[PDB]
Amino acid sequence: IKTIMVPDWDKVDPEIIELIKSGHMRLREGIVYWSKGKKLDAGIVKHPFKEMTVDLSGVNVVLAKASAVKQAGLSTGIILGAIVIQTVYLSKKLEKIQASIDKIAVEIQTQNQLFYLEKLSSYIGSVMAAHELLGIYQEHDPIPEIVGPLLVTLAQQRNELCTFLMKLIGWIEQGNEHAALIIDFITHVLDMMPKAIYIESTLYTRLGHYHHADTLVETAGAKYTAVLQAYRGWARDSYDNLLTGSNRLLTNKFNDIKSLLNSLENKILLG
Amino acid sequence: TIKTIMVPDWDKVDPEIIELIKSGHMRLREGIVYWSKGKKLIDGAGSIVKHLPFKEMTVDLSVELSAAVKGLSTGIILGAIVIQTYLSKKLEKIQASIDKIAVEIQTQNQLFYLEKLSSYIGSVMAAHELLGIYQEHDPIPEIVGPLLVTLAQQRNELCTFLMKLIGWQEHAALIIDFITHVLDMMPKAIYIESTLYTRLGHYHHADTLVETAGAKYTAVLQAYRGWARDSYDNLLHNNRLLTNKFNDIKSLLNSLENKILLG
Amino acid sequence: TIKTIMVPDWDKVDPEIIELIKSGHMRLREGIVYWSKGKKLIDGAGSIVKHLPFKEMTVDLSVELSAAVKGLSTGIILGAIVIQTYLSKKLEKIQASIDKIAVEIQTQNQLFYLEKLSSYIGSVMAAHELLGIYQEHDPIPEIVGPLLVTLAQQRNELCTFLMKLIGWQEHAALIIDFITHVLDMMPKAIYIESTLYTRLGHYHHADTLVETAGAKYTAVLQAYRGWARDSYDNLLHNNRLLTNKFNDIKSLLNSLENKILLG
Ligand SMILES: [Zn+2]
Numbered sequence: 001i002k003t004i005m006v007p008d009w010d011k012v013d014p015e016i017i018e019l020i021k022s023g024h025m026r027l028r029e030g031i032v033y034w035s036k037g038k039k040l041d042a043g044i045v046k047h048p049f050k051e052m053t054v055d056l057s058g059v060n061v062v063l064a065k066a067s068a069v070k071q072a073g074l075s076t077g078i079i080l081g082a083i084v085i086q087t088v089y090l091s092k093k094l095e096k097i098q099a100s101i102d103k104i105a106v107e108i109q110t111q112n113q114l115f116y117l118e119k120l121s122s123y124i125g126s127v128m129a130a131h132e133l134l135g136i137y138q139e140h141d142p143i144p145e146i147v148g149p150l151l152v153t154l155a156q157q158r159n160e161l162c163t164f165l166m167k168l169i170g171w172i173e174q175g176n177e178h179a180a181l182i183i184d185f186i187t188h189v190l191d192m193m194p195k196a197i198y199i200e201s202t203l204y205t206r207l208g209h210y211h212h213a214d215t216l217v218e219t220a221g222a223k224y225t226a227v228l229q230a231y232r233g234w235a236r237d238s239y240d241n242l243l244t245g246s247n248r249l250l251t252n253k254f255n256d257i258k259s260l261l262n263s264l265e266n267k268i269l270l271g
Numbered sequence: 272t273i274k275t276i277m278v279p280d281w282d283k284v285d286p287e288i289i290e291l292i293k294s295g296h297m298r299l300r301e302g303i304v305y306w307s308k309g310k311k312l313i314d315g316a317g318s319i320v321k322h323l324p325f326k327e328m329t330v331d332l333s334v335e336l337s338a339a340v341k342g343l344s345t346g347i348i349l350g351a352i353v354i355q356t357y358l359s360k361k362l363e364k365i366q367a368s369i370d371k372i373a374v375e376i377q378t379q380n381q382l383f384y385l386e387k388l389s390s391y392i393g394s395v396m397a398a399h400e401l402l403g404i405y406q407e408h409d410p411i412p413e414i415v416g417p418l419l420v421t422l423a424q425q426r427n428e429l430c431t432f433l434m435k436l437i438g439w440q441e442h443a444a445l446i447i448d449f450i451t452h453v454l455d456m457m458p459k460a461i462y463i464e465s466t467l468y469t470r471l472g473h474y475h476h477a478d479t480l481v482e483t484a485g486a487k488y489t490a491v492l493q494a495y496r497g498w499a500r501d502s503y504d505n506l507l508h509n510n511r512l513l514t515n516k517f518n519d520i521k522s523l524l525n526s527l528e529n530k531i532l533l534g
Numbered sequence: 535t536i537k538t539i540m541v542p543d544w545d546k547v548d549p550e551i552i553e554l555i556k557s558g559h560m561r562l563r564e565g566i567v568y569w570s571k572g573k574k575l576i577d578g579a580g581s582i583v584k585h586l587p588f589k590e591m592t593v594d595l596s597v598e599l600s601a602a603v604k605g606l607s608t609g610i611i612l613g614a615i616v617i618q619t620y621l622s623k624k625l626e627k628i629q630a631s632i633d634k635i636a637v638e639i640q641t642q643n644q645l646f647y648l649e650k651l652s653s654y655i656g657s658v659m660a661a662h663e664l665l666g667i668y669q670e671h672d673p674i675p676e677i678v679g680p681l682l683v684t685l686a687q688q689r690n691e692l693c694t695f696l697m698k699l700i701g702w703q704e705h706a707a708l709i710i711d712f713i714t715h716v717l718d719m720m721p722k723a724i725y726i727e728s729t730l731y732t733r734l735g736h737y738h739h740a741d742t743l744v745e746t747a748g749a750k751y752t753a754v755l756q757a758y759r760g761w762a763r764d765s766y767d768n769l770l771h772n773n774r775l776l777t778n779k780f781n782d783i784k785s786l787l788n789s790l791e792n793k794i795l796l797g
Contacts, residue, residue, distance in 0.1 A: 098431050102438070105380040118383040125428030132423060132487075136479040141318075143473060145416035153420065285575050287559065296550065312548050313576065313583050320576050 001055050004082045005030075008050035009070060016046060017071075026210070027074075029081060029202050033210040044208060047139070052079070056089060062265050077268045084269065085134055085202055090195050094124050097192060100185045104171070107181065112174040116164060120189065123157040127196045130154060134202060147203050154200050158193065162223045165189065166230045172242075179242055183253040187260050190231065193224055194266040214271070221270035232261055272333045276351045277302075277406070280326035288321055298478070299323075299343070301350055301466050305474040318474055332357060335528045346531045353532065354402055354466055358459045362392045365452055372449050375442055384432035388453070391425040395460045398422065398467055410470040422464050426457070426484065433491050437498050441509055447516045451523050454495065457488050458529040478534070485533035496524055535596045539614045540565075540669070543589035551584055561741070562586075562606070564613055564729050568737040581737055595620060598791045609794045616795065617665055617729055621722045625655045628715055635712050638705055647695035651716070654688040658723045661685065661730055673733040685727050689720070689747065696754050700761050704772055710779045714786050717758065720751050721792040741797070748796035759787055 007030055009017065016032060019025045024038040025045060032045040054063050064079040065072070083089055101117050130150055168186055172179045197220045204213035235257050243250055260266075279302065281289065288304060291297045296310045297320055304321040311318065328338065330352060339345050369385050376382065398418055401410075436450055461484045468477035499520045506513055523529075542565065544552065551567060554560045559573045560583055567584040574581065591601065593615060602608050632648050639645065661681055664673075699713055724747045731740035762783045769776055786792075 095431075098435070102379070102381065102435050106378070108380070110380055113380060115383075117381070121381075121383070121428060121431070122387075122424075125424045125431065128427040128431075129420070129423035132427065132480075132483055135483050136476050138473070138475045141473060141475065143416075143471075143476065145412035145471070146419050149417040149420045153424070287554070287557075287575055291550070294550075312550055314585060315578065322577060 001053070002087045004052050004054060004079075004086045005049040006052045006079060006082055008048045011048040013046075021071075026214070027078075028205050028210060028213055029085065031205055031210065036211055036214075044210075052082075054079075054083060054087075056083075056087060061089060062268070073268070080265065080268050081198060081202075084195050084198055085131075090131060090192070090199075091128070093188070093192055093195075094128055097185075097188055098124055100181075100188065104181065104185060107176055107178065108171055109174050109176060112171065116168060119157070119160065119164075123161060123196075126150075126153050126157055127192075127199065130196075130199050130203065134199065134206075137206070142207060144207050147207050151200060151203055154196065154203075158196060158200075158220065159223070161189075161193070162227050165227055166234065169234055169238075177249065179246070180249045180253045183250070184256065186231070187253070187256050190224075190228065191260050191263065191266070194221070194263075194269045197221060197224065198269045217271050224270070228261060231257065272331055274330050274332050274352075274356050276328050276330060276348075276355045277325040278328045278348060278351055279323040283324040284321075298474070299347070300469050300474060300477060301354060303469055303474065308475055308478075317472070319472065330356070335531065349528065349531055350462060350466075353459050353462055354399075355406075358399065358456070358463075359396065361452070361456050361459070362395060365449075365456060366392055368445075368449055368452070371445060375445055376436070376439065379435075379439060381435065384428070384435070387425055387428055388432065391422075391429055391460070394418065394421050394425055395463060398463050402463070402466060402470065405470050410467075412471055415467050415471050419464065419467055422460070422467075426460065426464070427487070429453070429457070430487055430491050434494060437494050441512070443506055444509065444512050444516050447513075447520065450495065451516070451519050454488075454492060455523055455526070455529070458485070458526075458532040461485060461488065462532045481534050488533070492524065495520065535594055537593050537595050537615075537619050539591050539593060539611075539618045540588040541591045541611060541614055542586040546587040547584075561737070562610070563732050563737060563740060564617060566732055566737065571738055571741075580735070582735065593619070598794065612791065612794055613725060613729075616722050616725055617662075618669075621662065621719070621726075622659065624715070624719050624722070625658060628712075628719060629655055631708075631712055631715070634708060638708055639699070639702065642698075642702060644698065647691070647698070650688055650691055651695065654685075654692055654723070657681065657684050657688055658726060661726050665726070665729060665733065668733050673730075675734055678730050678734050682727065682730055685723070685730075689723065689727070690750070692716070692720070693750055693754050697757060700757050704775070706769055707772065707775050707779050710776075710783065713758065714779070714782050717751075717755060718786055718789070718792070721748070721789075721795040724748060724751065725795045744797050751796070755787065758783065 007027075016025065020027065020032070024035055024040070025032050026035050027033075030049060031047055034040075034045060052067060054067065056063075061083055062076070062080060064076050064083070067079055098121065101120055105113065105117055133146070133150065165186065169182065171182045197217060200220065201213040201217045204210070204216060235254060239254060243254075279299075288297070292299060292304065296307055296312065297304055298307050299305075302323045302325065303319065304323060305318045306312075306320055328348070328351075330338075330348075332352075334352060334357065335345070335349060338348050366389060369389060373382055373385050376385075401415065401418070433450060433453060436446065439446075461481060464484070465477040465481045468474075468480060499517060503517055542562075551560070555562060555567065559570055559575065560567055561570050562568075565586045565588065566582065567586060568581045569575075569583055591611070591614075593601075593611075595615075597615060597620065598608070598612060601611050629652060632652060636645055636648050639648075664678065664681070696713060696716060699709065702709075724744060727747070728740040728744045731737075731743060762780060766780055
């Protein structure tokens, strides 16, 4: 049971709504702006919010489609993004990932851990700090000298994680149920990443760089999708060898892989 | 042992400013008076109201308990001591205990949390250095900004590390002393973080960050309390040592110093 | 005959602003509240404090004497009437009397003073126009500045002209009526000049200019008084006309309206 802030369209000028419908204006996190090449002489259009209640109980967060009285994917993505940015929904998943790290660190070979769990923990810390910074917010006082370096670190760590994440499947043959642990960990990290991308886009929007935010979502989502496709290929080539001569738990984890590949939540978050 | 700090000299402050502070229209942090959120009466863009005049004050560092005899002034002097002197000794002692703790948590294979903690020390120290330079010189946002990002990141990861420590004889005494002192350090570092925000002219950011970071610190503190309440009897020579450690825990749980620092 | 003016709506003003006005820290002119000279309490560069909220008020123009029943408010409403309505009629009547006065002063061979007076009318009118445009729109310094120079120049030369007129039957009645009405016009034009200064953000300039220009006006007025005291008996059908003219002189000499307009 949480209370978020959603755009109050009854207080929005109808011409703004019509220009949004025609594709001349776009929206990200309660801020309207001109679409690329659609401005009608430099520069932001307009920022009104009202309360909405959502019950965060393993609840399907996409709780949004039900909330359905006016103009569908647009408002659905609006409420999804509000849930991601304002609630503790992502904090619980980050703490779960840290718990998985804690458990995996004692179930591997010390020479095979190397430095990857450290990088994952650092990235989780950066995402937590970014969500916290999103929590402190003064609309009439931007903080570019802080949001800038934060976006830097977030971009570096996300790009690096994209390059070394699938490598971690090797930990299946490097134990000290184990394969299920590793697969679950990788799936949850991948499921978290689009939320972090959406946080990066929100931070870009807070600085007034809306087109930057759109393009960043596109390119980061492209790299993330490439990693997902590598994950899919590995699952296709390892399903039989893992479920024969090595039962219910691993099958549930492979089903979780398939659900990650068809995540409507991550599709909405990534445009 | 005798130190000299700068404190607001209210005899050089116009009484109308004092009054608007007492009416809640204005707030104060580390020598800066500013308008409260949504309480600005004049027409303008910023929120700064006044840079306070400073007088010298002698303190004896040999802390929450002599001055302020003429809640607000207590917090002012406490923050002045935290900023201008006290935390460096705590950080030195924390750094000194890192190796023996590494020995005791080696089987968890997450020693990098002790590296980052050390980095956190550096960061806090660097921050404490900047404020010193900023006692007579202008704050530089290209320097304060990245340091604030690093401080936030490392503070969040340190909270996760303390949670993992709680989740994991004399081994217990060593780890309990470590956890207690690291937790005790955190509110001062939060205060330093917020003072950097203030030096950048973001006073509302500073107040709200104290709120949020203190809530996270309080969540960790309550986890520590829950652990200490369910483990005191199953752990009792060394009995007196563990009893002193649990008394230190209870002192941290009711720390007036940290409650003042966290608002 | 019924006119509507904008007056400060004090029910929409924070009481602390009102209080700082009453303590002398802040002053007011035509909808603008600003810090008094050397009384600014906050840290800043400008002197602006507040743009007052405005309410509608009906007056009947058919003036210093109904409203303000809830010295300061009297001056506020008087200035609002001078700015937003009243002076135009006075200027029209002055312009209408210029030709007959030219006939009566032709032997002095300084009729250009009547040309400049006419220009002064234009200038004042143009100024009155700008303020109207400036009720909803931003003042433009490249427009207000040169007009202020012209207003100052023409006001000084008009004072010299009035002195020369004083230095120079029914001829007397005509010239006395002219002098009395021109002098009566001057304080309103001074007020308009100062309001232009206010619209440019130069409030202290406006107050000091009212002071200096009013001192010059008062010097001319006292010359007029000295002339009227030494000429009333040597000038007395037309006797009633001259008596009415001298009564108008005495009314101008004790004009509460002009004393309020000139501070
Ligand atoms: Zn390392």
